[PDB]
Amino acid sequence: IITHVGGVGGSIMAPVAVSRQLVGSKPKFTGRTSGGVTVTSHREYLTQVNNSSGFVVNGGIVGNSLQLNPSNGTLFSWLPALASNFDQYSFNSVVLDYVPLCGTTEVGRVALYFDKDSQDPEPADRVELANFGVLKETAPWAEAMLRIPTDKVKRYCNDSATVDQKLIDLGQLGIATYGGAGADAVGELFLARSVTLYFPQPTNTLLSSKRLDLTGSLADATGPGYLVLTRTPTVLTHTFRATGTFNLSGGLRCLTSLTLGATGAVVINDILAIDNVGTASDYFLNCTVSSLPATVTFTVSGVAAGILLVGRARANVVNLL
Amino acid sequence: GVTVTSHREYLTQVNNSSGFVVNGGIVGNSLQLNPSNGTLFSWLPALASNFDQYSFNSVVLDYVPLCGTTEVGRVALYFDKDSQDPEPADRVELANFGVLKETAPWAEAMLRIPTDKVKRYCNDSATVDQKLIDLGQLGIATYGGAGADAVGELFLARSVTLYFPQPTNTLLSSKRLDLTGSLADATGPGYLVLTRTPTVLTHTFRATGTFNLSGGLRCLTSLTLGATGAVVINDILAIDNVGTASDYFLNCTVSSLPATVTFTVSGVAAGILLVGRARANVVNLL
Amino acid sequence: GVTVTSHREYLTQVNNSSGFVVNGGIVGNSLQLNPSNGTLFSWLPALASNFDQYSFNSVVLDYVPLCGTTEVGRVALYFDKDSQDPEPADRVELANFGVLKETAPWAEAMLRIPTDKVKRYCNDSATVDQKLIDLGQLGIATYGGAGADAVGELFLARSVTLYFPQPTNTLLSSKRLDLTGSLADATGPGYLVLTRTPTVLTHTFRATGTFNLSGGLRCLTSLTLGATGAVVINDILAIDNVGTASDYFLNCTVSSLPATVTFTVSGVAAGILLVGRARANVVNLL
Amino acid sequence: IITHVGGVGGSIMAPVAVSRQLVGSKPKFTGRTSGGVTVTSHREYLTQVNNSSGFVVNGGIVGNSLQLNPSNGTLFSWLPALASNFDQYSFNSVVLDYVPLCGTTEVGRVALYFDKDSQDPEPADRVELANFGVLKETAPWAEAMLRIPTDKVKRYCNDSATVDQKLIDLGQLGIATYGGAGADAVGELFLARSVTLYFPQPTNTLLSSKRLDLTGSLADATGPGYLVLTRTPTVLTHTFRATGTFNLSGGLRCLTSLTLGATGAVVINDILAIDNVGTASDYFLNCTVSSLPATVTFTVSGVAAGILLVGRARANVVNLL
Numbered sequence A, D: 001i002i003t004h005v006g007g008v009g010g011s012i013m014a015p016v017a018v019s020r021q022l023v024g025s026k027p028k029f030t031g032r033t034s035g036g037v038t039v040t041s042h043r044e045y046l047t048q049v050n051n052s053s054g055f056v057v058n059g060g061i062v063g064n065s066l067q068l069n070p071s072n073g074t075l076f077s078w079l080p081a082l083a084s085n086f087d088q089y090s091f092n093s094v095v096l097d098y099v100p101l102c103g104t105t106e107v108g109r110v111a112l113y114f115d116k117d118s119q120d121p122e123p124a125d126r127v128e129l130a131n132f133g134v135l136k137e138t139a140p141w142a143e144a145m146l147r148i149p150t151d152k153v154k155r156y157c158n159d160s161a162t163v164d165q166k167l168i169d170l171g172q173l174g175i176a177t178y179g180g181a182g183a184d185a186v187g188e189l190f191l192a193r194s195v196t197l198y199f200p201q202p203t204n205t206l207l208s209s210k211r212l213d214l215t216g217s218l219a220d221a222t223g224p225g226y227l228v229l230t231r232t233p234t235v236l237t238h239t240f241r242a243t244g245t246f247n248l249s250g251g252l253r254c255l256t257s258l259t260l261g262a263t264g265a266v267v268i269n270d271i272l273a274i275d276n277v278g279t280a281s282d283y284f285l286n287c288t289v290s291s292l293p294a295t296v297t298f299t300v301s302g303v304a305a306g307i308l309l310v311g312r313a314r315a316n317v318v319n320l321l
Numbered sequence B, C: 001g002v003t004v005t006s007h008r009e010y011l012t013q014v015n016n017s018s019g020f021v022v023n024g025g026i027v028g029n030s031l032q033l034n035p036s037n038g039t040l041f042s043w044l045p046a047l048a049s050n051f052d053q054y055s056f057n058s059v060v061l062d063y064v065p066l067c068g069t070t071e072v073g074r075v076a077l078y079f080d081k082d083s084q085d086p087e088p089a090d091r092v093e094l095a096n097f098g099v100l101k102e103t104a105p106w107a108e109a110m111l112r113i114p115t116d117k118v119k120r121y122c123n124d125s126a127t128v129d130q131k132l133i134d135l136g137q138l139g140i141a142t143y144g145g146a147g148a149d150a151v152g153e154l155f156l157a158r159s160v161t162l163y164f165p166q167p168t169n170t171l172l173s174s175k176r177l178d179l180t181g182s183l184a185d186a187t188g189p190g191y192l193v194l195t196r197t198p199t200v201l202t203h204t205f206r207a208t209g210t211f212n213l214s215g216g217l218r219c220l221t222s223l224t225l226g227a228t229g230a231v232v233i234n235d236i237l238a239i240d241n242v243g244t245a246s247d248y249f250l251n252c253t254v255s256s257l258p259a260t261v262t263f264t265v266s267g268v269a270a271g272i273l274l275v276g277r278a279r280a281n282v283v284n285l286l
């Protein structure tokens, strides 16, 4: 069949393009009849690796997100709400898969790694990425793999909250691109799953609570974490980590009518915007992200207390009549 | 790619008290047995800084003695499993520890340490429950002396299993003082704290050996180089510009606590330095 | 009381040159396998620095791909048992070597390195017969390309046996320029050469990554910070005093050859610096 | 596996690129226990075929170099110094190998041939190259071969010298490129070796001696031949055929201080340059070629006698102190 030319048995072919074909990953639960507790193995997708001539990591996004715990609503788009009737998690297999949309003529580097410290900070440069134990180094166009070192320790989910994210999380996951020529798309990576659900509980809420200090930095958290809400002395920051349709509820301290800006992949849905000028205010809004960078920001003055809540929601109303 | 280390690192020179002193008659569980402890392990420092899980197999306290059969005191090495509990108050407390030893100063002593094989994490990301990650605490305690002179120099018998490797940590230290402030960033380890007082700096050692110092600061006012305690100055270079800020490189070599140094200056309105252990290495023009 | 090590370290980025080139067309058997070679081994940097003998078990060269199926060239990895013989002049010398591999640039390539079990010494005291101490030489060679762009990223398949425990071995580099002169001391390793020209400095990289730079010099004349090639400046701080000498701390991050930097100044009458690999770490006031 | 598209069994694939992978050729000697004389079979590389829109042959280089005798220091970079303890040569296999650095989109012709007359002159054009008995005709990007007709005649090496280069040499070797678009590189050719060493002698020196007549053309030779040293009425020519680090020794008749020029791949090493103006002069120099065209020339006047010697050498000194 195939006739390929200029080839004598034992020779190399670098083709114009390559592609694998990906299908319906329909999960299987297994009954580990135990404490009458469950086990799940399904395939959840994870992000579209775009290029970075320069040197970027999960989107140039920072605050080890990525985090291998399930939920990571940030990471795992389906497991979201099962390990949600449960309290202890434990994997058996997790494998990074890297397919490629681009073609044998893009010019760059992608790279998947694994840090056992859910908390150490991120890759600085070339020489650092490469020193990791569990790493892989691929041109972008060519097809790649990574399998992850799983213990069987009895590890806890984030339902109550826990600052030592390391003693509870399994690992960190990296994806890193340098040496590109443009920050376009070349890769879409997947997630090979297998998890052991344990002491199943009243089901935890997935709702987000995020306080800015009055002049300050940061008050409480509950998370998960889709959002960070910073202030700058005038003006807020609502910096997305998550994608989809959300629902936003809250307001803040200002005095000064709200001007609703945002930036990147964004589909505003319902912006409602009470103020009282002199005092504080409220915002409900409903938006829908499908990118990074998605940003939004409220524009205001004298941002002297920041409060919000975020808890994923449909094309759902959020405005008066 | 899992490395095993069994070495013998030096640790501190114990001075007496009449009174009742611990790990320097200093405080905040200094000695924590984790490697790094830049404070405790002067050698293991930048090996396990390429790794993420640590686990010992042997650790033994060794106590030799420089003094003579006529000093009058107590040395005492112990072991708290809670990297975090606070320190020895008095006589009756020190003695109640499981893994303790009670020796005169002149006489020669030992202690071996109870090691589990739990998969414990090193301090690259930070972790307030220093107990769930640290192996143990280490004590050394002296009461009943007659003078706070030196009688003992203690060592560290090592055996460690390094695991998942990625990125040496930072054998190199970065330490920012706010302009008027307190404290900017850190990278550490931490050998040094660099405080200011409104005039004048503080470089307060936690570490021992030959270092290398690089930096300068905001002042206006020529640098007068003082320091205090065990200290062997090596190279002090000292650019200023009076009116503005300045720079200091220097190379010194500590073998004590208390080692202090301080720069003397005025209007200390920004503090920056870096410290990353170094030899008898130059640090001055020609 | 000995160590063993098996990890994987990155090495340099193979660019292209239709000409015929060898390690960047730098010369003086740089790639030598010995560990340290700070130029070659970015990670083991600091284990074989606590040791005195070394011995490899595996060494494998790994060649992945930055370019694309239409890049147009030749790459080539080899191995000389004489840490000292000179480099490849042309195509025909390279091809005659025992341990060679010859690949497109675009396609992914391999090489295994031949290991003895001889008790070989590391470079702490110095040794002009670099051959009887070093295991082999490493080549990477590119000819017949069409542009001097990047095609390859080369790695290091490692497995090393450390023996008798040392007392550290500086990993902060010390590099003195004579007043009018050429060259004062060294400590090295060597990532950098610091030359002067009558006006102006040269900081010529041999190494890749995040460094930390500390020092200043003799001039009189405010500092203008240039550099050339793969370079990501991080923190440039720059005291001067005009009339006199000056200081520079800076933090940069190279991933190429050619990386250059140079300070621009006048009356370069003494050159001093130190360099000791460092993170994204601060190096400036506040 | 491979899925290649638009193909029904029996169809043709002309790929984006092809490459073979070449390794360490580590020679074997065989003991033909004879007159206690030796046999060698190893793989020596030979040149990088660059393109020639126009019509070029071993570099547009002329004076059948190329010559199949071993040594040919010009041709065989290793066999250089064994058939050097010997006096009779005889092959059994010699095969031209043509791999390719370029890609399936360069646009040209390469071509390997074989003339039984070590001495006939070179290919003029298209119609001439093709008429040879032992020739091969390849696009450049595609992968090629040629095997060579070996007799077993008892043929002599060039240790004493011999003007009928034909009665001693096995063959001529050609490589020819026409129809390009640029004189860049597409090919690197190799040499499949197998030689029978005979009456082994005191080992001959490899040193070159090259006399220009006073007004003339040409005095003696010893060779091998790496160099030709011509004059033009003013000025010399040192025209390389060889690559590497050499050592040059000599001077000449002029009167007129030496200006050292040269052209192409060249790394000058040590130029020393006595003159006496009025009279003659001397030059030692040490240079290092890795190309064709390498040229050098000395610039001078009244070039009334040319003498030199050349005998391959290291980064070795060649100047006073």
Ligand SMILES: [Ca+2]
Binding pocket: A087, A156, A157, A158, A159, A160
């Ligand atoms: Ca829980």
Ligand SMILES: [Ca+2]
Binding pocket: A115, A116, A117, A120, B051, B052, B124, B166, B167
């Ligand atoms: Ca880590």
Ligand SMILES: [Ca+2]
Binding pocket: A117, A120, B052, B122, B123, B124, B125
């Ligand atoms: Ca860590």
Ligand SMILES: [Ca+2]
Binding pocket: C080, C081, C082, C085
């Ligand atoms: Ca050699």
Ligand SMILES: [Ca+2]
Binding pocket: C051, C052, C122, C123, C124, C125
């Ligand atoms: Ca040594």
Ligand SMILES: [Ca+2]
Binding pocket: C052, C124, C166, C167
């Ligand atoms: Ca030693």
Ligand SMILES: [Ca+2]
Binding pocket: D087, D156, D157, D158, D159, D160
């Ligand atoms: Ca003969």
